[PDB]
Amino acid sequence: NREMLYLNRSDIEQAGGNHSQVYVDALTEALTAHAHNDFVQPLKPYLRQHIADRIIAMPSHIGGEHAISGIKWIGSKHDNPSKRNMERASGVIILNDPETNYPIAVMEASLISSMRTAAVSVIAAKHLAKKGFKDLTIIGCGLIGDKQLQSMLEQFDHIERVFVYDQFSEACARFVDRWQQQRPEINFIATENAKEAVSNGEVVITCTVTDQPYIEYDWLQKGAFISNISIMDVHKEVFIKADKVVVDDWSQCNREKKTINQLVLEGKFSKEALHAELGQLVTGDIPGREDDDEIILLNPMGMAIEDISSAYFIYQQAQQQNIGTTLNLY
Amino acid sequence: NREMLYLNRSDIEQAGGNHSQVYVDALTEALTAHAHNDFVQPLKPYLRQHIADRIIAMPSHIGGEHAISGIKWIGSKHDNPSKRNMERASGVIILNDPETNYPIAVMEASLISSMRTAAVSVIAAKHLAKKGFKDLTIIGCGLIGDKQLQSMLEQFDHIERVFVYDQFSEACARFVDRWQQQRPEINFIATENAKEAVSNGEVVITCTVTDQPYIEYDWLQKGAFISNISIMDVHKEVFIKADKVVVDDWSQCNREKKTINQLVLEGKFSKEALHAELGQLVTGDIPGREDDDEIILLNPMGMAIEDISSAYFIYQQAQQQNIGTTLNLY
Numbered sequence: 034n035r036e037m038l039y040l041n042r043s044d045i046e047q048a049g050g051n052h053s054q055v056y057v058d059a060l061t062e063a064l065t066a067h068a069h070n071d072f073v074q075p076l077k078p079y080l081r082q083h084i085a086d087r088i089i090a091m092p093s094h095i096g097g098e099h100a101i102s103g104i105k106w107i108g109s110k111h112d113n114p115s116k117r118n119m120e121r122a123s124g125v126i127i128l129n130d131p132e133t134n135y136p137i138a139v140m141e142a143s144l145i146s147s148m149r150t151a152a153v154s155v156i157a158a159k160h161l162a163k164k165g166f167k168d169l170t171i172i173g174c175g176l177i178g179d180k181q182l183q184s185m186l187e188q189f190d191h192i193e194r195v196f197v198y199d200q201f202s203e204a205c206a207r208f209v210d211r212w213q214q215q216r217p218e219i220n221f222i223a224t225e226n227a228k229e230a231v232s233n234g235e236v237v238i239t240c241t242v243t244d245q246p247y248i249e250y251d252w253l254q255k256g257a258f259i260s261n262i263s264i265m266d267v268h269k270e271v272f273i274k275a276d277k278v279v280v281d282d283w284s285q286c287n288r289e290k291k292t293i294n295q296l297v298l299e300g301k302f303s304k305e306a307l308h309a310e311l312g313q314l315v316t317g318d319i320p321g322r323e324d325d326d327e328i329i330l331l332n333p334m335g336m337a338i339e340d341i342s343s344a345y346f347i348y349q350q351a352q353q354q355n356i357g358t359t360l361n362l363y
Numbered sequence: 364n365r366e367m368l369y370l371n372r373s374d375i376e377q378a379g380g381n382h383s384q385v386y387v388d389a390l391t392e393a394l395t396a397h398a399h400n401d402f403v404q405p406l407k408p409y410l411r412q413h414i415a416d417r418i419i420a421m422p423s424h425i426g427g428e429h430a431i432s433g434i435k436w437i438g439s440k441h442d443n444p445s446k447r448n449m450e451r452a453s454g455v456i457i458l459n460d461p462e463t464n465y466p467i468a469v470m471e472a473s474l475i476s477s478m479r480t481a482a483v484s485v486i487a488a489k490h491l492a493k494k495g496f497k498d499l500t501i502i503g504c505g506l507i508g509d510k511q512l513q514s515m516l517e518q519f520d521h522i523e524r525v526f527v528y529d530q531f532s533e534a535c536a537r538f539v540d541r542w543q544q545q546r547p548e549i550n551f552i553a554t555e556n557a558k559e560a561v562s563n564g565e566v567v568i569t570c571t572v573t574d575q576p577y578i579e580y581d582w583l584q585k586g587a588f589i590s591n592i593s594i595m596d597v598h599k600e601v602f603i604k605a606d607k608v609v610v611d612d613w614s615q616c617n618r619e620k621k622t623i624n625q626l627v628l629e630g631k632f633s634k635e636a637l638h639a640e641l642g643q644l645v646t647g648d649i650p651g652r653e654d655d656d657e658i659i660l661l662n663p664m665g666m667a668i669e670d671i672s673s674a675y676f677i678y679q680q681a682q683q684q685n686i687g688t689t690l691n692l693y
Contacts, residue, residue: 035449035453039369039469039690041690041691041692041693042692042693043691043693073410073411073412075408075409075410075420076408077408078405078406078407078408078420078422079405080403080405080422080423080424080432080434081403082403082424082426082430082432082461086464087464088422088432088434088459088464090405090408090420090422090434092408092410092418092420092436093410094410094412096412100412102410102412102418102438104410104418104420104434104436106422106434106436106457106466108432108459108464108465108466109464110462110463110464113463113464117463119365119463119465123365123463123464123465123466123692124466125457125466125469127436127455127457129418129438131412132440133440133443133447133449133453134416134417134418134438134439134440134443134453135438135449135453136436136438136453136454136455139369139455139469141692141693358690360369360371360688361371361373362371362372362453362471363371363372363373363471
């Protein structure tokens with residue numbers, strides 16, 4: 034019979050998707066396959082009927098000993114939390130057996146999506162953050178910020194303070210209150226503005242939904258690593274002044290015309306100026322942080338192979354634990 | 364609760380998806396919205412790890428009084444029937460509420476896909492075939508050919524003979540035998556070659572999987588309508604010599620470099636030479652067949668709005684009849 038496994042968010046959590054390790058492990062493998070160019074990843078088509086209101090199709094194939102195909106079909110409505118009391122992002126991931134191309138799994142996407150994006154920060158930090166760093170900064174208190182924080186805390190037990198800013202001060206206060214209770218020994222500090230938050234972080238993670246940059250280069254401590262997960266938060270000067278700029282995929286960043294492409298089109302950046310793709314750091318191909326004064330920027334577009342790899346890892350754990358609903362295709 | 368309806372192929376059939384009318388009705392509306400440019404349809408990204416071995420993401424939004432978003436994620440392995448005794452094509456359609464962008468349905472795609480492609484031929488024939496035509500030609504005896512035939516027979520009761528060719532003579536014989544039993548009064552004729560089949564058809568439908576053209580212009584009877592569903596079957600001269608060429612979407616056909624784009628890039632065709640987009644015939648914007656000697660070619664790329672419209676029609680019928688499996692997203 035042609036069957037598929039359906040995994041809702043509860044099943045995904047039950048199968049290990051509520052903690053970072055599975056994502057770190059999945060993405061380490063996927064980033065390795067990426068550095069060996071053993072994947073295929075078409076440009077993501079956006080469906081706009083805000084730069085946030087859209088549904089994005091993210092297909093990819095990851096080659097290798099355990100190859101997998103699939104697509105993340107993920108949408109957002111800026112309005113959902115405020116007007117409808119629903120999460121902003123929603124979606125499904127479909128997995129496909131590359132032997133037959135048949136769909137084999139239908140899974141909830143939003144948890145997986147935000148967890149894999151947090152694992153991006155984790156893996157980058159393992160390579161690019163100062164060793165033993167004590168101060169973490171989160172900008173933006175949504176579900177992205179929440180998974181970013183959860184994952185950093187799981188992966189780096191030396192974090193002692195967390196600086197937190199959201200321009201909706203209310204969202205900030207609720208976020209700090211819950212986390213302060215979740216982790217009583219860690220000092221969570223709600224800051225009065227983004228500058229205060231950024232200025233204090235040895236690792237800074239941007240998790241907002243604006244498209245105007247506010248982060249200025251001189252807010253950055255010497256030795257800082259900034260994981261610019263929400264893309265548009267960082268002023269252009271930062272790209273020009275950081276000692277190292279890392280991306281997930283050069284060809285994606287250099288599409289017309291994202292911030293890096295605009296920099297290239299004037300005479301201000303080039304593939305030559307780029308320190309690394311992330312996968313290249315994973316493989317030990319190119320060094321990561323080399324001293325403790327370097328200010329280092331990661332600017333990831335976000336890649337389908339990350340979603341499909343993660344979802345696939347979780348699917349196998351679910352199958353092993355008899356989790357999920359078996360559906361018939363026919 | 365965030366819930367979705369899962370409809371497998373059996374449910375889709377139970378909900379009316381096993382007959383043409385629902386597709387004709389869905390596509391008439393979608394083609395109307397297309398002619399009024401009330402849709403958004405990104406270029407389809409192909410995932411190739413044969414021109415047939417791939418998975419295609421087909422996202423679209425159809426505006427209008429009952430707007431709907433969604434994606435068809437549909438794959439093929441040339442090999443599946445021969446090596447694995449599985450259907451070549453497989454896939455899922457996901458539907459999305461454009462209010463929130465949340466997914467609302469997960470449905471089996473392959474039946475819907477082939478049925479909507481047959482409805483394309485039906486609707487085009489209503490506008491472009493000679494009225495009362497008696498002779499139908501099917502080239503290719505797969506599931507595409509099968510749905511094309513089923514739908515023409517349902518929609519045109521004046522068909523008296525069906526000329527059938529498949530280059531795998533065995534596939535042809537099995538197809539004719541089953542259909543001869545299904546419809547005993549109609550003469551099904553297995554032909555010795557494609558030329559014999561094409562030469563006899565007042566309506567000719569191409570349903571093969573080759574990428575080399577064999578159909579020559581002078582095989583075509585005066586007054587013929589050819590629905591070139593499998594795209595590559597028709598020699599270039601046909602595009603140049605037909606009295607009318609109709610497409611589903613000009614911008615899609617003129618992408619670099621399909622047959623029509625190659626014609627445009629040399630000096631041999633232009634948007635000026637094109638008689639119509641299909642939607643324009645539906646709206647009564649541009650006349651269809653104007654006399655009974657005209658030889659008329661339809662060359663459809665295939666469009667996401669057709670899949671999503673059809674799936675949406677079927678979803679509503681399913682909801683009304685309590686068909687399908689309710690899934691939780693969370």
